[PDB]
Amino acid sequence: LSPAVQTFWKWLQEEGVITAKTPVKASVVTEGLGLVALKDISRNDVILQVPKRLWINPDAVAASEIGRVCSELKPWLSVILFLIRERSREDSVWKHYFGILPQETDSTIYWSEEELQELQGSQLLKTTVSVKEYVKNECLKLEQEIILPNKRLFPDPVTLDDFFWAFGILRSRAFSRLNLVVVPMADLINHSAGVTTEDHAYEVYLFSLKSPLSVKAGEQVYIQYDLNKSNAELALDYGFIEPNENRHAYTLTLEISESDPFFDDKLDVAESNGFAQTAYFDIFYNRTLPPGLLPYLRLVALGGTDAFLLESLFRDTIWGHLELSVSRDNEELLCKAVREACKSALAGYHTTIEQDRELKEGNLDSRLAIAVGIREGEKMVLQQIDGIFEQKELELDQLEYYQERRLKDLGLCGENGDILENLY
Numbered sequence: 007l008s009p010a011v012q013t014f015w016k017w018l019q020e021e022g023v024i025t026a027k028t029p030v031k032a033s034v035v036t037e038g039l040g041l042v043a044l045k046d047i048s049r050n051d052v053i054l055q056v057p058k059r060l061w062i063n064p065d066a067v068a069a070s071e072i073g074r075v076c077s078e079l080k081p082w083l084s085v086i087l088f089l090i091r092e093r094s095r096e097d098s099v100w101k102h103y104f105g106i107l108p109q110e111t112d113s114t115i116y117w118s119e120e121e122l123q124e125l126q127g128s129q130l131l132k133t134t135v136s137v138k139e140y141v142k143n144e145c146l147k148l149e150q151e152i153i154l155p156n157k158r159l160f161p162d163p164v165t166l167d168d169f170f171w172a173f174g175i176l177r178s179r180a181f182s183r184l185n186l187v188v189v190p191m192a193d194l195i196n197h198s199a200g201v202t203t204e205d206h207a208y209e210v211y212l213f214s215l216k217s218p219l220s221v222k223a224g225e226q227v228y229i230q231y232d233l234n235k236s237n238a239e240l241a242l243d244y245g246f247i248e249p250n251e252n253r254h255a256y257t258l259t260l261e262i263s264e265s266d267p268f269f270d271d272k273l274d275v276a277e278s279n280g281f282a283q284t285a286y287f288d289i290f291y292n293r294t295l296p297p298g299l300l301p302y303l304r305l306v307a308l309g310g311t312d313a314f315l316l317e318s319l320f321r322d323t324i325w326g327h328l329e330l331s332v333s334r335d336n337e338e339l340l341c342k343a344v345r346e347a348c349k350s351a352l353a354g355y356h357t358t359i360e361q362d363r364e365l366k367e368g369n370l371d372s373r374l375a376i377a378v379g380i381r382e383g384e385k386m387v388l389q390q391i392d393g394i395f396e397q398k399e400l401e402l403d404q405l406e407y408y409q410e411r412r413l414k415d416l417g418l419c420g421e422n423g424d425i426l427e428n429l430y
């Protein structure tokens with residue numbers, strides 16, 4: 007097998023953790039390290055359990071030598087520093103656990119400049135670049151505010167690599183739903199599209215992991231990392247994606263510009279209905295547009311002519327109207343805005359969908375495969391969106407806007423009400 011694996015496996019028996027009746031060895035699988043059922047397991051069977059003594063959460067850092075100095079930091083920043091530091095101490099509780107952690111994953115946060123060029127024009131690149139920079143500024147701030155003014159607690163220097171290594175280990179291993187917890191033993195199961203339950207989470211302290219599927223002997227025990235993450239999210243959080251086109255998403259960002267002559271009123275309408283000055287709408291392949299996207303698009307493109315809808319008079323129905331539609335001019339405007347954005351975006355990629363699909367037909371390397379898959383999907387979504395609005399441009403006269411809806415209850419053909427007027 008592998009030295010480190012045993013130096014870690016044993017350390018688990020010597021901690022009391024892995025008992026004698028735990029059907030699950032740790033072997034090498036296509037996805038690195040994994041848990042292979044030592045014998046037939048069945049739905050909901052407890053695979054293993056670990057002592058809170060072994061976690062690595064915001065409480066562990068607070069209840070440690072550096073908890074005082076990290077008393078103010080956000081939880082994820084706190085944990086990174088603890089991880090980096092614990093890693094340096096050749097007398098840390100997790101000396102052997104650190105000896106098993108991969109020095110890297112396929113998460114876009116580790117991709118070289120060449121590998122990242124494979125994502126040119128993708129929203130995943132923007133997101134990865136944006137996240138990388140932000141974790142950087144945050145970690146350079148931690149260096150001068152805590153790491154440097156305390157060289158006693160932080161002996162060895164800390165590089166950007168040191169931080170990123172940790173930020174990754176936290177993003178691809180920590181168990182959220184229980185919010186950041188590490189569990190050296192159960193921190194081995196891999197993800198499988200086969201699992202569709204997501205019930206594995208459980209704790210009697212003691213972390214208890216149970217197999218969601220029935221696994222025969224020799225096979226690998228899996229779990230569903232997350233049924234809702236988009237492919238772009240799986241790519242950055244862990245180092246992998248799924249072929250399932252229903253995981254492809256593209257998130258649209260909307261906002262009420264401050265240079266908008268009706269900013270104040272518009273903002274009041276949006277917040278009054280659950281939306282901020284800035285709103286993010288996730289668009290998944292083959293799904294129907296998110297509720298609120300169209301009305302918010304209409305609010306953004308409002309304009310002088312229909313500005314009358316922002317008066318106190320409609321401050322109680324304005325959203326219902328935005329939901330139905332405002333006017334052909336408003337509708338036509340937003341449709342073009344979206345369509346242009348899609349085309350603009352689509353043109354930012356360096357490969358066609360056909361090229362991506364042909365590439366997929368051959369043998370691609372982990373990261374290259376991730377890039378191709380992601381970009382093909384984003385292009386699919388982008389085109390789906392543009393298609394939806396191209397159709398709306400055609401059906402531009404099938405919609406009954408405000409004015410029409412208004413004159414629907416005129417009652418022109420009522421009675422000769424003048425006969426009564428003369429009877430008093």
Ligand SMILES: Nc1ncnc2c1ncn2[C@@H]1O[C@H](CSCC[C@H](N)C(=O)O)[C@@H](O)[C@H]1O
Pocket residue numbers: 037038039040107108111112178179193194195196197198243244245246
């Ligand atoms: N279905 C899958 N395909 C590819 N890699 C996977 C995977 N499920 C899990 N992984 C890998 O394992 C990580 C989760 S931690 C699980 C243990 C890991 N296999 C190891 O050897 O250390 C992920 O971030 C990813 O790099």
